[PDB]
């Protein structure tokens, strides 16, 4: 049914148009930490806690 079919009287028939889309992507920030006291690394059982 939809086949492009021409005749001898070639004219404004079978017009086609094209489309252009787009794809996005963002950037997000993360992070975490932890706190310690000098009284937790000075007199503590382990020497290499840090």
């Amino acid at each position: 049914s939809k086949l492009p079919l021409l005749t001898e009287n070639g004219g404004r028939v079978n017009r086609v148009g094209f489309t252009r889309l787009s794809r996005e992507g963002s950037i997000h920030k993360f992070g975490f930490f932890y706190e310690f006291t000098q009284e937790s690394l000075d007199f503590d059982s382990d020497d290499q806690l840090k």
């Binding site: 975490f32 932890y34 706190e35 059982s45 382990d46």
Partner: protein, 50 residues
Amino acid sequence: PKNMGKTIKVYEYVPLLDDRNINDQGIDANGAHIVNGNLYGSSKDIGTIT
């Protein structure tokens, strides 16, 4: 080594992302303190980690 008792004890550091990391030093992403501090621990879900 001699002059120390017959027992020998070694330490074992647990990863941050482990269920054995039962601690209290924890702050959620907004600022309110939370019960856990292991950052969802092991918990190979999707909902909890998101």
